[PDB]
Scaffold this motif. Structure first.
Motif, PDB file in Angstrom:
ATOM      1  N   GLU A  90     -12.185   3.078  11.193  1.00  0.00           N
ATOM      2  CA  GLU A  90     -11.061   3.521  12.012  1.00  0.00           C
ATOM      3  C   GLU A  90     -11.483   3.727  13.461  1.00  0.00           C
ATOM      4  O   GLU A  90     -10.728   3.408  14.386  1.00  0.00           O
ATOM      5  N   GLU A 125     -11.612   0.510  15.371  1.00  0.00           N
ATOM      6  CA  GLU A 125     -10.267   0.027  15.666  1.00  0.00           C
ATOM      7  C   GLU A 125      -9.700   0.710  16.904  1.00  0.00           C
ATOM      8  O   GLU A 125      -9.095   0.056  17.762  1.00  0.00           O
ATOM      9  N   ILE A 126      -9.885   2.026  17.013  1.00  0.00           N
ATOM     10  CA  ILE A 126      -9.357   2.756  18.161  1.00  0.00           C
ATOM     11  C   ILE A 126     -10.061   2.315  19.438  1.00  0.00           C
ATOM     12  O   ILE A 126      -9.432   2.182  20.495  1.00  0.00           O
ATOM     13  N   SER A 160     -11.473  -0.639  19.920  1.00  0.00           N
ATOM     14  CA  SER A 160     -11.052  -2.006  20.205  1.00  0.00           C
ATOM     15  C   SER A 160      -9.723  -2.023  20.949  1.00  0.00           C
ATOM     16  O   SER A 160      -9.536  -2.807  21.887  1.00  0.00           O
ATOM     17  N   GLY A 161      -8.786  -1.165  20.543  1.00  0.00           N
ATOM     18  CA  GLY A 161      -7.507  -1.104  21.232  1.00  0.00           C
ATOM     19  C   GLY A 161      -7.620  -0.479  22.610  1.00  0.00           C
ATOM     20  O   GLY A 161      -6.930  -0.892  23.546  1.00  0.00           O
ATOM     21  N   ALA A 162      -8.488   0.525  22.754  1.00  0.00           N
ATOM     22  CA  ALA A 162      -8.671   1.169  24.048  1.00  0.00           C
ATOM     23  C   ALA A 162      -9.444   0.294  25.024  1.00  0.00           C
ATOM     24  O   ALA A 162      -9.311   0.476  26.239  1.00  0.00           O
ATOM     25  N   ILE A 199      -9.183  -3.108  25.660  1.00  0.00           N
ATOM     26  CA  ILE A 199      -8.225  -3.928  26.391  1.00  0.00           C
ATOM     27  C   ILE A 199      -7.329  -3.037  27.243  1.00  0.00           C
ATOM     28  O   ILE A 199      -7.645  -2.743  28.395  1.00  0.00           O
TER      29      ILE A 199
END
Ligand SMILES: Nc1ncnc2c1ncn2[C@@H]1O[C@H](COP(=O)(O)OP(=O)(O)OP(=O)(O)O)[C@@H](O)[C@H]1O
Ligand SMILES: Nc1ncnc2c1ncn2[C@@H]1O[C@H](COP(=O)(O)OP(=O)(O)O)[C@@H](O)[C@H]1O
Ligand SMILES: [Mg+2]
Ligand SMILES: [Mg+2]
Lengths: 48, 55, 68, 470, 512
Positions: A38, A41-42, A44-46, A48
């Protein structure tokens, strides 16, 4: 009967405890992997 | 006597269905080939047109 | 590796078997327990109009004849 | 005259380039030249006269530079009795093919929730006809109601039963907002209401509104079509002091739809990938669904539990807003009991000895304690069995199963599946039936008769009938 | 039609051929990598529009940015280079549809890969189209016979619904689909258009050797004449795997809107999500949970929601979807499986344990469920299907007590044995579909308890011999069950009397 039963429960309860402790280790290991999954994932989104 | 009469009776219909089924399949089967010959003939016409373009 | 299902099935299984026999006894006990005026006036008035002699036995049978 | 123009199109997110007088946030923009009416809701001001919007319809066919018109107000939908008995779209278009919708006026789908001073909260029992619900988790007229259930647990059929039992014979109006669910269920419900006379073509009838945001709709529409249905209920509430019955289908799709675009909007994903504004976005909707001095709204909303994981942020935050809760358990369905209402997890804010009669509260806890004790005995019974238990424990397990099986109630909506006609149970008969079992009135008869029955008397008569049969 | 008449019409048709060309904007590729092409300029381009590169391969413009345009290469991107030309066609992605599609094998784009000949079709429909509304739909009230005993009895599939074939690798997911296609072949031969069901098989991310074996089986049984195979292999670019499901779905809408019935079979969708995830990740889009895009739920929902039962006003057509999902270790709590389950109506759970224990098809009836329920089954099936579920429910409970043992009540012994007959009865081999009427007879004998007489190991062979015996001597009985579709009382008495009698005649192991 009662003598053999008592010994059987002692051996059975013993095996039950050993297996329960083993799964506890795997549960903690799975907990760490869950946070890692998890968390990546956080990030990876932050990113970009 | 009643088992023989009912046997030949129902067996007579089975033979009747066998013939008409054969006469119908041979007819439909022939029609299938007939359509294939027609398509092959027209296919040559298209093949001739494509070759004319190449020339 | 599924021990929760094993315990769950054992619970439902034994309970069903145990209570299945209890159902038989319950049906037998309740079964053993089950094993152990206005119409009279209507017919009587009719018999009055014809002024015919009437008895309770006749009225009871006619009343039973109506229900039958 | 179109002021904006398309500049960027990616997926469902569309950006518009304005020359001057940028539109306020949440405003509705009309794109010109599209085969179908496309509406864009302003969500963010990126600067340089740029605005990022979400498309309500498929963005395929759009073209960069296409003119966009500014309406100057958020998405407005038709309100009034004209929407009663008619299916409407997220943008207010009638998809029922019955013609245009007549509305006395148009209200915006975005508004501030009523203040706290004018809350005017009230508690009133709602007899829904379901014995398991009316006993353990009573519903309050004008308070939120939650139906937590997983995939294929019976929450959709339960909503249909509540409509069949609650919507009809209701002086006030009713609204049905179906967001994110499959379209097949929508066609079935429409035909069901038509056959049941809940809706009709003859004007002046069909005291019920239908709104659908089914899966076929793209993201953004499913997240705002819910507001459309709410606006209809708000109109019937404010303009008329009439009790409104708001039947909201699975709402998890609302928060889910927001996350489907939250990534493209620039937000950082949350712990479970949801948008950081889940609490605020969901809070804005829940706070608006409440009773006020003008009117009251009894909202029946279902919460889809993905993977049967109640720890998900979306449903976890919903519990705080709900007055009455109905958590569906999958274990009961395996046993055949329906409705599969979890007696322990299900709670109700009305379950208070001061609010409801002390007898009703006593019988409620008596059943919960009985079932809780039986659940604990399952462990020892698995190894030793019920025979090795004491007479006291045997009776607890015996009555617990009979009460648990008696919770099953067949309704009209389940006839096609089961084949037994529906049945209605009153509150008085409900409390009396279970109260008698708690005292051991039915401990003698077999547990087989206490299954899919309406009242205790019905179970006893069925038991005696089986006796004479054999 | 005479040969001369057809030739004249053939020549006239070739004469009337129009070809118009207009100015089409073109742009240059700023960069190309991993199948993603950034195009400069090329303005006034529509989303999803088709574009053609210099080599001749097509492309789909998905990302329309103010600076550049993100294009996906619909094929091999080895020849693409910086500065190459990109010409916009001016039409959204589409695929050919019609009746000529049956009996061929196409790719995601629709090109035939069989090598037989060019596709002779004139109708082309857009791949992605808005699903039907609420009014056009209609309640599902027609059975979709798959040929499987357990499915046609416990989990009935009605034409127009959505059933999910979920299971692990090598659990019989494809076997179920094959058995269904084979079952519909019989109805295709006989002149019953109301029961003909066109089959469409969408292959996404599958080795060509397996697809080749799949097509051979269809031809072996002559079931390919009404089958359509769309191939999106692993070597195929991600967009092809992303569009192949929607592509095949468009082919199904043809039969749907034309009052016909079509069955579309979507292979593993997890492979589509990987391709759709890959396609989205390479476009530099923000990833979601599990690295998948945020709108991955909208992907499958938009696809499966199209399958519906059109009303009689539009022709009464229907489209049935059978999406497949592959699970890693039987964990259905994952993200993608959970979503698909909530979208479809029913789901068929496959268990690896049941598979190796001899239960094939390994179907977990305890979890499988269908919204349509008995509404699709025939009269003769609903009556027998109801009691069958209850009997099997009890057997699963007593399974544990068998280990307990040490005693067994007379009734429990019967219920335990009775349930064993049903499980042994529902078993079915691969590539062996059964007729609907034949299942009624076998399933009837099981619930009535007649199978409790003969040994379990002999029940399977009795099924074959019993059905064969009925087909020969008792043919009128089968005809009534088929035509009327109801089990009359006269058939009950006749069937109830011959079933015990036949068991005594044939040589079987009668000792229970
Ligand atoms: N009902 C069955 N009866 C007998 N054998 C079977 C049955 N089902 C599968 N098999 C065997 O299992 C193998 C193929 O399994 P199958 O393709 O049906 O499962 P699958 O999940 O679709 O596999 P994959 O995911 O690789 O496509 C074959 O060896 C086949 O013979
Ligand atoms: N109480 C119930 N009454 C009637 N049918 C039920 C009930 N519970 C489950 N079903 C079963 O559930 C399935 C339908 O699930 P559904 O109610 O549609 O869930 P959802 O609300 O998510 O759509 C049907 O196959 C049906 O057999
Ligand atoms: Mg639902
Ligand atoms: Mg497979």
């Amino acid at each position: 009967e009662q003598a053999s039963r008592m010994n059987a429960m002692e051996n059975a309860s013993k095996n039950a405890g050993e297996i329960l402790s083993k799964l506890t280790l795997d549960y903690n290991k799975a907990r760490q992997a869950k946070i890692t999954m998890e968390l990546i994932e956080i990030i990876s989104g932050a990113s970009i | 006597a009643d088992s023989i009469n009912n046997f030949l009776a129902n067996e007579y219909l089975r033979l009747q269905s066998h013939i008409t089924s054969r006469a119908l399949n041979i007819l439909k089967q022939a029609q299938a080939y007939e359509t294939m010959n027609q398509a092959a003939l027209l296919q040559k016409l298209i093949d001739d047109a494509t070759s004319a373009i190449d020339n | 590796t599924r021990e929760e299902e094993w315990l769950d099935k054992r619970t439902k299984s034994q309970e069903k078997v145990y209570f299945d026999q209890e159902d038989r006894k319950a049906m037998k006990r309740l079964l053993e327990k089950l094993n152990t005026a206005p119409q009279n006036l209507e017919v009587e008035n009719i018999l009055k109009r014809y002024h015919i002699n009437y008895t309770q036995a006749l009225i009871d049978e006619l009343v039973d004849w109506k229900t039958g | 005259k179109a002021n904006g123009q398309v500049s960027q199109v990616i997926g469902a997110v569309v950006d518009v380039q304005f020359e001057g007088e940028l539109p306020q946030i949440l405003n509705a923009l009309e794109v010109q030249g599209t085969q179908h009416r496309l509406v864009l809701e302003v969500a963010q001001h990126l600067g340089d006269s740029r605005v990022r919007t979400i498309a309500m319809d498929s963005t395929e066919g759009l073209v960069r530079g296409q003119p966009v018109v500014d309406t100057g107000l958020p998405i407005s939908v038709p309100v009034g009795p004209g929407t009663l008995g008619r299916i409407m779209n997220v943008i207010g278009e009638p998809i029922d093919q019955r013609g245009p919708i007549k509305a006395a006026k148009l209200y915006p789908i975005h508004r501030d929730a009523p203040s706290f001073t004018d809350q005017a909260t009230s508690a009133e029992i709602l007899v829904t006809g379901i014995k398991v619900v009316d006993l353990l988790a009573p519903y309050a007229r004008g308070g939120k109601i939650g139906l937590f259930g997983g995939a294929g647990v019976g929450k959709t059929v339960l909503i249909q039963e509540l409509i069949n039992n609650v919507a009809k014979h209701h002086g006030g109006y009713s609204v049905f907002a179906g967001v994110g669910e499959r379209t097949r269920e929508g066609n079935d419900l429409y035909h069901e209401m038509m056959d049941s006379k809940v809706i009709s073509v003859k004007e002046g009838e069909s005291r019920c509104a239908l709104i659908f945001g089914q899966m076929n709709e793209p993201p953004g529409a499913r997240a705002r079509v819910g507001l459309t249905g709410l606006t209809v209920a708000e109109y019937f509430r404010d303009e008329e002091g009439k009790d409104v019955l708001l039947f909201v289908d699975n709402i998890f799709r609302f928060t889910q739809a927001c996350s489907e675009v939250s990534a493209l909007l620039g937000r950082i994903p949350s712990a479970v990938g949801y948008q950081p504004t889940l609490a605020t976005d969901l809070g804005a909707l829940q706070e608006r669904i409440t009773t006020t001095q003008k009117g009251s709204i009894t909202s029946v909303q279902a919460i889809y539990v993905p993977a049967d994981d109640l720890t998900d942020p979306a449903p976890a935050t919903t519990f705080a807003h709900l007055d009455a809760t109905t958590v569906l358990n999958r274990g009961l369905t395996e046993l055949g009991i329906y409705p599969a209402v979890d007696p322990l997890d299900s709670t109700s804010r009305m379950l208070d000895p001061i609010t409801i009669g002390e007898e009703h509260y006593t019988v409620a806890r008596g059943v919960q304690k009985l079932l809780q004790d039986y659940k604990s005995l399952q462990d020892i019974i698995a190894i030793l069995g019920v025979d090795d238990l004491s007479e006291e424990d045997k009776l607890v397990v015996a009555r617990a199963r009979k009460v648990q099986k008696f919770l099953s109630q067949p309704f009209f909506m389940s006839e096609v599946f089961s084949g037994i006609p529906g049945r209605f149970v009153n509150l008085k008969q409900n409390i009396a039936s279970f109260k008698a079992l708690l005292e051991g009135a039915g401990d003698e008869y077999p547990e087989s008769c206490f299954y899919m029955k309406g009242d205790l008397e019905e179970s006893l008569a069925a038991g005696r009938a089986d006796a004479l049969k054999s | 039609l005479s040969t001369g008449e057809a030739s004249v019409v053939l020549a006239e048709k070739i004469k009337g051929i129009t070809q118009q060309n207009d100015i089409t904007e073109y742009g240059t590729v700023i960069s190309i990598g991993d199948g993603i092409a950034r195009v400069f300029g090329l303005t006034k381009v529509q989303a999803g529009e088709m574009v053609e590169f210099k080599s001749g391969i097509r492309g789909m413009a998905l990302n329309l940015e103010t600076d550049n345009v993100g294009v996906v290469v619909l094929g091999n991107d080895r020849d693409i280079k910086e500065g190459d030309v990109v010409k916009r066609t001016g039409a959204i992605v589409d695929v050919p549809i019609g009746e000529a599609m049956c009996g061929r094998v196409f790719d995601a784009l629709g090109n035939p890969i069989d090598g037989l000949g060019p596709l002779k079709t004139t109708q082309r429909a857009r791949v992605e189209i808005k699903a039907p509304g609420i009014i056009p739909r209609q309640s599902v009230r027609q059975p979709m016979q798959t040929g499987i005993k357990c499915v046609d009895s416990l989990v009935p599939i009605g034409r127009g619904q959505r059933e999910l074939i979920i299971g692990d690798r090598q659990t019989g997911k494809t076997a179920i689909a094959i058995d269904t296609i084979l079952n519909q072949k019989e109805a295709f031969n006989t002149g019953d258009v109301k029961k003909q069901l066109y089959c469409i098989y969408v292959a996404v991310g599958q080795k060509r050797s397996t697809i080749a074996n799949l097509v051979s089986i269809l031809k072996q049984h002559d079931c390919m004449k009404f089958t359509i195979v769309v191939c999106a292999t692993a070597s195929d670019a991600a967009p092809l795997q992303f569009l192949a499901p929607y592509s095949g779905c468009a082919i199904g809408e043809f039969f749907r809107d034309n009052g016909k019935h079509a069955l579309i079979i979507y292979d593993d969708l997890s492979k589509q999500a990987v391709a759709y995830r890959q396609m989205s990740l390479l476009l530099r889009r923000p990833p979601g949970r599990e690295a998948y895009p945020g709108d991955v739920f909208y992907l499958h929902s938009r696809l499966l929601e199209r399958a519906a039962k059109m009303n009689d006003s539009l022709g009464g057509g229907s489209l049935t979807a059978l999406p497949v999902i592959e699970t890693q270790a039987g964990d259905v709590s994952a993200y993608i499986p959970t979503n698909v389950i909530s979208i479809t109506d029913g789901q068929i759970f496959l268990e690896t344990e049941l598979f190796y224990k001899g239960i094939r098809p390994a179907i977990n009836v305890g979890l499988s469920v269908s919204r349509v329920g008995s509404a699709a089954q025939i009269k003769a099936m609903k009556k027998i299907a109801g009691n069958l579920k209850l009997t099997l429910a009890t057997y699963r409970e007593l399974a544990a007590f068998s280990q307990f043992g040490s005693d067994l009540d007379a009734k429990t012994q019967q219920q335990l044995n009775t349930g064993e007959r049903l499980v042994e009865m529902l078993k079915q081999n691969q590539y062996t579909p059964m007729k609907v009427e034949e299942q009624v007879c076998i399933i009837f004998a099981g619930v009535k308890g007649f199978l409790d007489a003969l040994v379990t190991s002999e029940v399977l062979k009795f099924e074959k011999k019993f059905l064969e015996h009925v087909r020969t001597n008792h043919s009128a009985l089968l005809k009534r069950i088929r035509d009327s579709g109801d089990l009359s009382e006269v058939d009950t008495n006749e069937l109830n009397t011959i079933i015990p009698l036949f068991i005594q005649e044939g040589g079987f192991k009668l000792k229970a």
